[PDB]
Design an enzyme around this catalytic site. Structure first.
Site, PDB file in Angstrom:
ATOM      1  CG  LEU D  38      24.820  -1.622-105.767  1.00  0.00           C
ATOM      2  CD1 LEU D  38      23.359  -1.978-105.072  1.00  0.00           C
ATOM      3  CD2 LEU D  38      25.540  -1.391-104.904  1.00  0.00           C
ATOM      4  CG  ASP D  39      20.901  -5.749-111.150  1.00  0.00           C
ATOM      5  OD1 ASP D  39      22.080  -5.788-112.377  1.00  0.00           O
ATOM      6  OD2 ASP D  39      19.732  -6.708-111.372  1.00  0.00           O
ATOM      7  CB  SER D  40      21.556  -2.023-114.638  1.00  0.00           C
ATOM      8  OG  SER D  40      20.906  -2.867-114.744  1.00  0.00           O
ATOM      9  CD  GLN D  43      24.175   3.051-111.418  1.00  0.00           C
ATOM     10  OE1 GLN D  43      24.684   2.197-110.842  1.00  0.00           O
ATOM     11  NE2 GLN D  43      23.988   4.405-111.402  1.00  0.00           N
TER      12      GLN D  43
END
Ligand SMILES: NC(=O)C1=CN([C@@H]2O[C@H](COP(=O)(O)OP(=O)(O)OC[C@H]3O[C@@H](n4cnc5c(N)ncnc54)[C@H](OP(=O)(O)O)[C@@H]3O)[C@@H](O)[C@H]2O)C=CC1
Ligand code: SF4
Lengths: 156, 114, 290, 80, 208
Positions: D38-40, D43
Site C-alpha cells: 500500500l502507498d503512504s 496509508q
C-alpha cells in the site's frame, strides 16, 4: 387568406410593441460605461425612445455588453445573461467588447464577447460615440421590425 | 552554500505537511461536491485529486515541496470558501477532449508534433 | 482536391479540420449537439433553416469566427436545397417533426424530403451522406411514425444508395423529449423493455463515422448499454425526481415496442465508448422543488 | 463493553469496506506498507478513515509511525 | 544647450549625494550601493536581510521622515543568480525627496513582509506574490489578486509568454464555460526593431 391578414397585422402589432421602448440593463465595465452614461445625457436622451436605464435583470429587454471582458468576469456575465426574459437581444458596444480590441493578444482577456453570448448588434469605436450607439439602437429597432415571428408560426 | 529554508528541515517534515494537506483535501471534497451542485461522483474527484498529488512525485528540494504545500493550502482555503465557482472546479477536470494520444500512428495522421 | 481542405496543424477553434458539413434541421436538439461538436472540431458548417433568426442566433456563437453559416430553404422546393449543397463535402439529413401539422402530416416529410435532398445530393456528388432515423422502424402495425421512417429508409437505400442509414434508440440529454415527457405528467402500467442511450457518445460516433472511411453503405444502430424495464425506468425517474403535445401517437411510441437487432454494429464496434444512464441522469435530474 | 477484539473486528470490516486493495488478505501480521503493498497515500487514507470512524484527533506523526493494523488497534486502545 | 534642454538642480545633486553618503556611512551592515541619478533621485541598493531594520530606520530617525510609500516592484531580470528586484519607493513629507530602495532577491529565498512597518505595503505584497512568486514569510494574507483562481503560473515573468496557455469559451455540451488550450486566430506579429550602431556611447559596457 383572411387568417393570413389577421396574423400579419397581429404580428406587426406585437413586434411594434416590442420595438417601442426596449429598456436594457447597463452592464458596463470600463470607459464604455461612461459613454453609456453620456448617451443618457441631456443632449442625447435614451428616454425619448422608451429606453430606460434599469439594472433590474428580470425585466431587461436587451442587454448592452460594453467594456473589456475578462476571464474572471465571464462566468458571472453568462450567469447574469441567463436570468433574463426569453426575448433577448445583445448590443456589443466598444472595440474591447466586439472582438478584444487593444487587449487582444493578452491573457485574462476574453477575445471579444462572441465567446460567451450570442451578439446581435456590433457598434465599434473606442469609445463608440453616443451618436453611433444611438444609430446602432435604431438599427436594432429595425431588426426587430423585420422578424416575421407569428407568420412563421402560422405557416408552421 | 548557506541558503535559507522556508519551513522544514528536510523532506520528512515536508512529507508531514503534505500528508496533512492531503488529509484536509480528502475530507474537504464531500462538502464541495454537495455545495456546488456538481456532476461527478465523489470517488472520481478524489481519484483525480490524489492523481494530482501523484503528478509532482519527483521533487526533492524542501523549499519547493513547502511551496507546493503553500499553494495547496491557498487553493484549499479558496475552495472551502465559496469564492470560486462551478467553472473553476470543472476546470480542474479535463473533460473537453482533445483525446490526442501518444500513438505514433495517431501522431502521424495529425502530425508535426515532436 | 484543392488545398485548405486538408487538416491544418492541431484541432479545434480555427485549427482547421477537413470536412465541410451541410446539415439539415439542426435547430433541433441532436442537431444542436452535432453543430456544437463540429465547432469543437472546428470544421465549417452550413446550416439552412426556415424559422426566425432567433433560434439560429442562439446556436450561432457556438461556432467560431465565420465558421458556421446560415441560409434558407423551404419544405417544397429543390432549388434552395441545391443552392445549399452546391459546395458541400459531406451532408446530413436530420429532419422531422414528431406529430402532424395542418400543412405537414407524417406524409411527404419523411417521404418527400429525404428523396428530394438525396436526389439533389447525388446530383451534386457528395460523399458520406448520413441520414438519421429511429431504431425499430418497421413496416408492421400500430406505428405510422415508424412505418414512414421505414419507407424513408427504403428511399435512402434506393435513391442515392451510397449513403449511411443510421438509427439510435431513445436518446436523452439536457433537452430530452421523453425525460421531460415523464416529468410533465398529471400514466399506465404495462410490460415493455426499452434501452436509452446518452446523447454525446451518439453524436461522437456520428462525427467519427462521417470523418472516417470504411463506414459508407453500412447501416448503424445505437444501443442502450443496460436495456432495462420500462416500469423500473418510470419508478427510477419518479424516485430521483423526488415527488412521491401528448397525443395518442406519442404515448404509443413510448409504450409499444422496443427490441434489439443483431445484424448491425452498435457503439464500441465503431470505436466509441458508451456511457450508461446513471451519472448523466443524476446530472440532468434537477428541478426537484424549490 | 469496550472490548479489544470488537474494535479489531470493526477495523476488519471497514478494511473490507475499503476498495483499493484486493483481496482482503488481512492479519495482525500484515504490515501493509510493502508486505501487502500500500502507498503512504493509501496509508493516510486508512488512518483518517479510522480517525473518522471511532477516533480522536490522531495527529499524523504518531499516526504515521503505526505501519501495522495490530499496532493501529493497540494505539486506539492506548489513546482511547 | 540653452534652449530645449531640461535643466538640472545641482544643489539637489550635492544634497542627495551628502545624504546618501551619510546613510551609507551610518549603516555599514547592509548598504552596498548608493547612486545618484543624473536627474537627481536617490537610489539605495540593499541586501535582503536589512528589510525590516532599514525600513524601521527610514520611517523614523527624524533626520529623514519618509512616511509615504510608493511602489514595491519586482522587475524580472534573468542572467542573474538573484533574479528579481523588490523596489520600495519612499517619499518624505517634510523634505520633498524620493529614494528608491532596490533590495535584491532570488526565486525562492523570501523577504520579510513590510506590512509590519508599512500598512500600505499589504496589497502590494499580495499582488507581487500573485504575479511573480517572491515568497513573503511572516505575512498574514497571501492570496490571489489580479488573476483567476483557476489560473496560475505567475504571468508577469519573462518566462511566461504573452498569450496565456488557457482560453475560455462557452459550450452547450456541458452547458457551461470551459477552458481550452490557446488557439490564436492571428499571429501577434513580433517586430525585430533594435537597430545597431550604438545610440549612446556613454553607456558602453566593457567587453570580455
Ligand atoms: N425520440 C426522439 O426524440 C428521437 C428522435 N430521433 C430523430 O431525430 C429527430 C428529432 O430530433 P429533435 O431535435 O429531438 O427534434 P426536432 O423536431 O426539433 O428536430 C427536427 C428539426 O427539423 C425541423 N423540421 C422538421 N420538419 C420540418 C419541416 N417539414 N419543415 C421545416 N423544418 C422542419 C424542426 O423545426 P424547424 O423547421 O423550426 O427548424 C427541427 O429544427 C427526428 O428526425 C427523429 O426521427 C431519433 C431518435 C430518437
Ligand atoms: S473600447 Fe475603448 S472606450 Fe470602450 S472599454 Fe475598450 S478601451 Fe474603453
Amino acid at each position: 387568406s383572411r387568417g393570413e391578414y389577421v396574423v400579419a397585422k397581429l404580428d406587426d402589432l406585437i413586434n411594434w410593441a416590442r420595438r417601442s421602448s426596449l429598456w436594457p440593463m447597463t452592464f458596463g465595465l470600463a470607459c464604455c460605461a461612461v459613454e453609456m452614461m453620456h448617451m443618457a445625457a441631456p443632449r442625447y436622451d435614451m428616454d425619448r425612445f422608451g429606453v430606460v436605464f434599469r439594472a433590474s435583470p428580470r425585466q431587461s429587454d436587451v442587454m448592452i455588453v460594453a467594456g473589456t471582458l475578462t476571464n474572471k468576469m465571464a462566468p458571472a456575465l453568462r450567469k447574469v445573461y441567463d436570468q433574463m426574459p426569453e426575448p433577448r437581444y445583445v448590443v456589443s458596444m466598444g472595440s474591447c467588447a466586439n472582438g478584444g480590441g487593444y487587449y487582444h493578444y493578452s491573457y485574462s482577456v476574453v477575445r471579444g464577447c462572441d465567446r460567451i453570448v450570442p451578439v446581435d448588434i456590433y457598434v465599434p469605436g473606442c469609445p463608440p460615440t453616443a451618436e453611433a450607439l444611438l444609430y446602432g439602437i435604431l438599427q436594432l429597432q429595425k431588426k426587430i421590425k423585420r422578424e416575421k415571428r407569428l407568420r412563421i408560426w402560422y405557416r408552421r | 552554500t548557506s541558503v535559507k529554508p522556508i519551513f522544514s528541515r528536510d523532506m520528512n517534515e515536508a512529507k508531514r505537511r503534505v500528508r496533512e494537506l492531503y488529509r484536509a483535501w480528502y475530507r474537504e471534497v464531500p462538502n464541495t461536491v454537495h455545495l456546488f451542485q456538481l456532476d461527478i461522483s465523489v470517488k472520481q474527484g478524489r481519484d483525480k485529486v490524489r492523481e494530482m498529488f501523484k503528478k509532482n512525485a519527483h521533487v526533492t528540494d524542501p523549499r519547493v515541496v513547502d511551496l507546493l504545500v503553500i499553494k495547496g493550502k491557498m487553493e484549499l482555503e479558496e475552495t472551502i470558501n465559496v469564492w470560486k465557482q462551478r467553472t473553476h472546479v470543472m476546470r480542474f477536470f479535463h473533460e473537453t477532449e482533445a483525446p490526442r494520444p501518444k500513438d505514433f500512428l495517431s501522431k502521424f495522421y495529425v502530425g508535426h508534433d515532436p | 482536391l484543392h488545398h485548405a481542405v486538408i487538416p491544418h496543424g492541431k484541432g479545434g477553434r480555427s485549427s482547421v479540420s477537413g470536412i465541410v458539413a451541410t446539415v439539415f434541421g439542426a435547430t433541433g436538439f441532436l442537431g444542436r449537439y452535432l453543430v456544437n461538436h463540429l465547432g469543437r472540431m472546428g470544421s465549417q458548417v452550413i446550416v439552412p433553416y426556415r424559422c426566425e433568426p432567433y433560434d439560429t442566433m442562439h446556436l450561432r456563437p457556438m461556432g467560431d469566427l465565420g465558421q458556421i453559416i446560415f441560409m434558407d430553404w423551404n419544405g417544397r422546393d429543390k432549388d434552395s436545397i441545391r443552392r445549399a449543397v452546391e459546395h458541400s463535402n459531406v451532408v446530413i439529413n436530420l429532419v422531422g417533426r414528431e406529430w402532424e401539422t395542418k400543412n405537414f402530416d407524417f406524409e411527404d416529410v419523411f417521404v418527400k424530403i429525404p428523396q428530394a435532398i438525396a436526389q439533389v445530393s447525388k446530383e451534386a456528388g457528395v460523399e458520406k451522406f448520413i441520414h438519421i432515423s429511429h431504431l425499430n422502424a418497421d413496416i408492421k402495425s400500430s406505428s405510422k411514425y415508424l412505418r414512414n421512417k421505414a419507407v424513408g429508409e427504403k428511399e435512402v437505400r434506393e435513391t442515392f444508395p451510397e449513403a449511411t442509414i443510421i438509427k439510435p434508440a431513445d436518446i436523452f440529454g439536457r433537452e430530452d423529449r421523453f425525460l421531460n415527457y415523464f416529468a410533465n405528467i398529471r400514466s399506465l402500467g404495462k410490460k415493455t423493455v426499452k434501452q436509452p442511450v446518452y446523447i454525446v457518445d451518439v453524436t461522437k460516433g456520428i462525427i467519427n463515422a462521417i470523418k472516417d472511411p470504411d463506414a459508407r453503405g453500412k447501416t448503424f444502430a445505437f444501443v442502450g448499454p443496460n436495456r432495462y424495464l420500462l416500469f423500473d425506468l418510470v419508478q427510477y425517474v419518479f424516485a430521483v425526481a423526488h415527488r412521491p403535445w401528448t397525443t395518442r401517437d406519442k404515448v404509443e411510441r413510448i409504450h409499444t415496442t422496443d427490441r434489439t437487432l443483431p445484424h448491425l454494429p452498435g457503439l464500441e464496434d465503431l470505436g466509441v465508448q458508451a456511457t450508461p444512464l446513471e451519472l448523466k441522469a443524476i446530472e440532468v435530474l434537477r428541478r426537484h422543488r424549490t | 463493553p469496550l472490548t479489544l477484539e470488537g474494535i479489531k473486528d470493526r477495523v476488519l470490516y471497514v478494511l473490507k469496506l475499503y476498495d483499493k486493495i484486493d483481496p482482503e488478505k488481512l492479519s495482525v501480521n500484515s504490515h501493509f506498507m510493502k508486505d501487502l503493498g500500500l502507498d503512504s497515500l493509501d496509508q493516510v487514507e486508512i488512518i483518517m478513515a479510522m480517525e473518522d470512524e471511532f477516533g480522536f484527533e490522531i495527529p499524523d506523526i504518531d499516526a504515521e509511525k503505526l505501519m501495522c493494523p495490530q499496532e493501529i488497534v493497540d494505539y486506539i486502545a492506548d489513546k482511547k | 544647450t540653452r534652449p530645449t534642454v531640461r535643466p538640472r538642480n545641482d544643489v539637489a545633486h550635492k544634497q542627495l549625494s551628502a545624504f546618501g553618503e551619510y546613510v551609507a556611512e551610518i549603516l555599514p551592515k547592509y548598504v552596498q550601493q548608493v547612486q545618484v541619478s543624473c536627474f537627481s533621485e536617490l537610489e539605495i541598493c540593499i541586501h535582503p536581510d536589512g528589510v525590516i531594520p532599514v525600513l524601521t530606520f527610514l520611517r523614523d530617525h527624524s533626520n529623514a521622515q519618509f512616511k509615504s510609500l510608493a511602489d514595491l516592484t519586482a522587475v524580472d531580470i534573468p542572467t542573474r543568480q538573484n533574479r528579481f528586484e523588490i523596489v520600495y519607493n519612499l517619499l518624505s513629507l517634510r523634505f520633498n525627496s524620493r529614494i528608491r530602495v532596490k533590495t535584491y532577491t532570488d526565486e525562492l529565498t523570501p523577504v520579510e513582509s513590510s506590512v509590519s512597518v508599512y500598512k500600505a505595503a499589504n496589497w502590494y505584497e499580495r499582488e507581487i506574490w500573485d504575479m511573480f512568486g517572491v515568497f513573503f514569510a511572516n505575512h498574514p494574507d497571501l492570496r490571489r489578486i489580479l488573476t483567476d483562481y483557476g489560473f496560475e503560473g505567475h504571468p508577469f515573468r519573462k518566462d511566461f509568454p504573452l498569450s496565456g496557455y488557457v482560453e475560455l469559451r462557452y459550450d452547450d455540451e456541458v452547458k457551461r464555460v470551459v477552458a481550452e488550450p490557446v488557439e490564436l486566430a492571428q499571429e501577434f506579429r513580433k517586430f525585430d526593431l533594435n537597430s545597431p550602431w550604438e545610440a549612446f556611447p556613454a553607456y558602453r559596457q566593457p567587453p570580455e
